[PDB]
Amino acid sequence: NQYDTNTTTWSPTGRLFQVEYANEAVNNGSAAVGTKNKDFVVLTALKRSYQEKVFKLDDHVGMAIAGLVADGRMLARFVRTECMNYRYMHDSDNPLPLIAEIVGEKYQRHIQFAGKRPFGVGLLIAGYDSTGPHLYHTVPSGDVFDFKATAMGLRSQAARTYLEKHFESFPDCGLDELIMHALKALAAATAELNIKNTTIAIVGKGTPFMVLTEEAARKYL
Amino acid sequence: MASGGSVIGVKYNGGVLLACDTLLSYGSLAKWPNIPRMKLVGAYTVMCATGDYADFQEMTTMIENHVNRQQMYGGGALTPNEVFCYLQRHVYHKRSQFEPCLCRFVVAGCHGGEPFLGGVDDVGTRWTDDCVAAGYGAYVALPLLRQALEKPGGLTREEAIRVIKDCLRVLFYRECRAINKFQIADATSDMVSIGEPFEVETNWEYDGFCFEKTAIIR
């Protein structure tokens, strides 16, 4: 294949292959799920010799990653820095729609120039601001999707199949049923779920972004 | 070096008032008597300043553009509290490069059924209170407004207007660079309106001001 080596080469059918291949890094990462109701967002992740998959980005926002961890960390440092500057200048939370836009724009600069490599990582970003809860998914091509529920990583089609049956009932759910739907979706992409291989994180109304401890996660696993 | 004189503000039960005169001076010369010195910012906020008019214009143009753009591009409408914070970081940064903004600001607004009032000086000092002033308003007006806010309960709109006019009256008697022509801005119900210019009533006819009594040689 004469068109699959560089990010700066269009193929004769109008495709960009190096960007499709970076997107396979994501699809072979370990699975992660997100869901939301009227006032919360939940993320869950398979973290099995502990491997860090969830990161806090500010008081009101965090994310899960899938794919290359060192690229994950580089994006986490960028978003952290952006949220700190916003709060310095305004004394309030950086709005979630603006976070999702600057991230998208940073991915895209790395798919158009020969001296840069695409980021091989997918994020689920969860947060809570003045207009409510938000859940975004970002991918190596630079696209950003705003979701009521989704899943990324290995065998995440099964998780997505489960969420398509139940998601229309999630607005009325309480925080406890919402956490349970998120673990049953992650279970479909899988050994079983214990407190030592599964992360649960939450953010919402009156709740800063937090990761449950092993004590608090016992109640659900 | 066009410059503006005093500004004064006070909170009442349900809103906030801000007042100044329509004059820019150049040294002692009274150069332009018909200048609107108060500026609307976004949906909820109004500002005014004492000191260098060119620096007030640069700073407010810059803040107004940021506020309109952030809203047009999908990041919501900034509140008076956020606008105030942003102003203060810009003034401190310029102080720190030895290129100061040579003004003193007063900011007022109303958002969430909650009124705002605050000041910022040219080294970046910031404060909020039930009454705020700049220029000679800080020496002449604050003493009167602080006494009116001593009554328990707070001021009505009518009481607030009456004490604001007593202050403007004294500034015209005792501040050299002044005219008798003022505007009042009212922020209440999550919006700001600016009134038409008016004048205050003054007393010049006391017996003790007469030609015989004030004579140096009898």
Care to describe what's here?
The structure is cut from a larger assembly and holds chains A (221 residues) and B (218 residues). In chain A, strand 3 (54-58) and strand 4 form a beta hairpin. Helix content of chain A is 32%, strand content 27%. In chain A, the strands form two sheets. A five-stranded antiparallel sheet of chain A has the order 8-1-2-9-10. In chain A, strands 3-4-5-6-7 form a five-stranded antiparallel sheet. In chain A, helix 4 packs antiparallel against helix 5 (175-187). With 221 residues, chain A is of the alpha+beta class. By secondary structure, chain B is α+β, with helices and mostly antiparallel strands. Chain B has five helices and 13 strands. In chain B, the strands form two sheets. In chain B, strands 1, 4, 5, 6, 7, 8, 9 and 10 form an eight-stranded antiparallel sheet that branches. In chain B, a hairpin with a 4-residue loop joins strand 8 and strand 9 (115-120). In chain B, helix 3 packs antiparallel against helix 4. The longest helix of chain B is centred in the first third of the chain and has 20 residues, at 53-72. Chain B starts with a strand and ends with a helix. Chains A and B meet through helix 2 and helix 3 of A and helix 2 of B. The PDB classes it as unknown function. Keywords: Proteasome, unknown function. CryoEM structure of recombinant Trypanosoma cruzi apo proteasome 20S subunit.
